[PDB]
């Protein structure tokens, strides 16, 4: 069974791929530009993203929004993750939290799929702690910095099995999976 | 101020860091295993465990039971509300209900805080009823299918700082913070 995933995120198509695949699921990364509104949570980014594709893009297809939303700052960067992340970067959420008594935050993920003329979603949540420096060379965006709960390694140290194993978007995709197990029987 | 929350529950630790740390305490999981003891009430429990635990961990500490009483059910899964949730689970319970005119139950959280040399307890109360189906991606345990009187949602379907507004647990950890108001000034 194929998916068309609509995203820019090579990154993100490489883990879904990965976690799929092994499924007998093979992901179609299409790159068809939609807009992300502003919203204060992923679900509503998704839900406008799936209706503004519909139609125009072929079927069965997903999206995703993902973010970190650290405690401390209340919730910040949260949906705006990627933009906070290309303008101060990983040396930026450091400096912000320099001294904090709290490191505490989570990374969640939405997934939206549309197939039959229906939309649905799928999220996952793993809650963590951002680390004093950043460590490792795998993974995108703040992985070097986030360590999630049980771990003694950076999302960023390691590999995009091990990182499906514990991340939010490993979870969003077991929630997807079971879905399609049980509605589509592929 | 901080306080050692002993327990090996991140979903508690998470709530009582939320509600706590809003008034400059600083919740650290400890995580050192004490006998939980067979007995009829959440109280005896928590007794038992800060007499096991005094003088082994840091001070002051804090450790908290709680569990789910339904009406119907003669008070079960009560103390054992976490045994009966991991044997069988949200499904078991529904299953258990089919056909009951009072689907009414409450939630109990007690905590148990010890400082300077001498023990205390605080606990909270809150009435609900056990719902047809399990909704919700929040909280744990049986969070899915209790609603707590006067709302629409499940536990499971708020937020930490919306359960902690509506929850037994919240109930305790107000009149905890009460009393380190008074008694500690920090």
């Given at each position: 069974?194929?998916?068309?995933?609509?995203?820019?995120?090579?990154?993100?198509?490489?883990?879904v791929?990965?976690?799929?695949?092994?499924?007998?699921?093979?992901?179609?990364?299409?790159?068809?530009?939609?807009?992300?509104?502003?919203?204060?949570?992923?679900?509503?980014?998704?839900?406008?993203?799936?209706?503004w594709?519909?139609?125009?893009?072929?079927?069965?297809?997903?999206?995703?929004?993902?973010?970190?939303?650290?405690?401390?700052?209340?919730?910040?960067?949260?949906?705006?993750?990627?933009?906070?992340?290309?303008?101060?970067?990983?040396?930026?959420?450091?400096?912000?939290?320099?001294?904090?008594?709290?490191?505490?935050?989570?990374?969640?993920?939405?997934?939206?799929f549309?197939?039959?003329?229906?939309?649905?979603?799928?999220?996952?949540?793993?809650?963590?702690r951002?680390?004093?420096?950043?460590?490792?060379?795998?993974?995108?965006?703040?992985?070097?910095?986030?360590?999630?709960?049980?771990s003694?390694?950076?999302?960023?140290?390691?590999?995009?099995?091990?990182?499906?194993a514990?991340?939010?978007?490993?979870?969003?995709?077991?929630?997807?999976?079971?879905?399609?197990?049980?509605?589509?029987?592929?």
């Amino acid at each position: 069974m194929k998916i068309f995933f609509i995203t820019s995120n090579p990154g993100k198509v490489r883990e879904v791929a990965n976690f799929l695949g092994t499924f007998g699921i093979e992901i179609v990364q299409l790159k068809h530009e939609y807009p992300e509104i502003q919203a204060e949570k992923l679900e509503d980014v998704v839900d406008f993203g799936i209706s503004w594709l519909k139609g125009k893009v072929p079927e069965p297809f997903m999206i995703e929004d993902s973010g970190l939303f650290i405690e401390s700052l209340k919730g910040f960067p949260g949906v705006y993750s990627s933009y906070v992340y290309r303008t101060i970067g990983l040396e930026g959420i450091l400096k912000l939290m320099e001294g904090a008594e709290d490191r505490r935050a989570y990374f969640k993920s939405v997934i939206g799929f549309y197939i039959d003329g229906k939309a649905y979603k799928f999220s996952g949540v793993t809650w963590g702690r951002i680390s004093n420096e950043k460590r490792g060379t795998h993974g995108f965006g703040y992985d070097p910095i986030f360590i999630p709960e049980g771990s003694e390694k950076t999302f960023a140290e390691m590999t995009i099995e091990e990182k499906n194993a514990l991340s939010h978007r490993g979870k969003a995709l077991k929630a997807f999976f079971e879905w399609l197990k049980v509605n589509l029987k592929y």
